[PDB]
Design a protein around this ligand. Structure first.
Ligand SMILES: *[C@@H]1O[C@H](CO)[C@@H](O[C@@H]2O[C@H](CO)[C@@H](O[C@@H]3O[C@H](CO)[C@@H](O)[C@H](O)[C@@H]3O)[C@H](O)[C@H]2NC(C)=O)[C@H](O)[C@H]1NC(C)=O
Ligand SMILES: *[C@@H]1O[C@H](CO)[C@@H](O[C@@H]2O[C@H](CO)[C@@H](O)[C@H](O)[C@H]2NC(C)=O)[C@H](O)[C@H]1NC(C)=O
Lengths: 153, 54
């Protein structure tokens, strides 16, 4: 399910941000922003890494398999052999394609949930003195410097 | 033709050197080889929707 954040109420991503997937953009008295948030992206990296390693280690490697031989009077067993091999081949390719096609929406909704939760945290600890304006920004009724920027972060 | 490297997987169309769990070349393998399938593209996403800003 599309949680609403990526390409939703928040516009598209940022080119200038480098070292992460989730960051902030501050405009205090002496600078501009583009700093990452190393907490949540670390859990994201660890979850996706465990995901890919699990998907690798569930599929078993196959050992030696050589095609066999038959004379002209054993056509029945040969047709049985061909039916066996094609049936197993179809089952394995169906399982692989279906596994990838579910895993893709799983990870995209995972990123969407990460964006929305990181937004709700910043809103919830700025419960009055913020003045939200649109597409995930705040405008700070009091004065703030870099110290309270990192105090938010 | 026959040459003298050393692999862990062997097919009639040549040798394989990988660690991916799936395989596309030929369904007759000797050694320890990834599993043969009948597809073309198994790209798996680890990341975000690349939406550029305007
Ligand atoms: C999360 O961010 C807060 C932001 O308030 C961090 O607190 C601040 O940490 C800095 C670390 O350099 C402190 O700055 C320096 O502290 C030394 C030692 O007292 C002092 O000599 C310097 O003049 C300067 O103040 C700062 O005191 C501290 N507190 C405040 C109110 O800014 C916090 O450490 C960060 N991490 C965590 C896990 O909370
Ligand atoms: C099979 O492929 C792997 C992955 O590329 C090779 O492993 C590395 O290959 C590079 C370049 O050949 C070497 O510099 C590294 O030392 C290799 N790493 C290890 C741990 O051996 C591997 O050499 C390839 N083997 C064959 C027979 O082609």
């Amino acid at each position: 399910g599309l949680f609403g954040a990526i390409a939703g109420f928040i516009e598209g991503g940022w080119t200038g941000m480098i070292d992460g997937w989730y960051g902030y953009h501050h405009q205090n008295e002496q600078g501009s922003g583009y700093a990452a948030d190393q907490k949540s992206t670390q859990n994201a990296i660890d979850g996706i890494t465990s995901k890919v390693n699990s998907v690798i280690e569930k599929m078993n490697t196959q050992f030696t398999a050589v095609g066999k031989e038959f004379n002209n009077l054993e056509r029945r067993i040969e047709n049985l052999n061909k039916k066996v091999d094609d049936g197993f081949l179809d089952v394995w390719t169906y399982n692989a394609e279906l596994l990838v096609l579910l895993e893709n929406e799983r990870t995209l909704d995972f990123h969407d949930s990460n964006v929305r939760n990181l937004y709700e945290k910043v809103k919830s600890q700025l419960r009055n003195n913020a003045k939200e304006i649109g597409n995930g920004c705040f405008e700070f009724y009091h004065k703030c410097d870099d110290e309270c920027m990192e105090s938010v972060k | 033709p026959v040459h003298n490297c050393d692999t862990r997987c062997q097919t009639p169309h040549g040798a394989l050197n990988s660690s991916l769990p799936f395989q596309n070349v030929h369904p007759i393998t000797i050694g320890e080889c990834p599993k043969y399938v009948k597809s073309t593209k198994l790209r798996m996403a680890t990341g975000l929707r690349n939406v550029p800003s305007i």
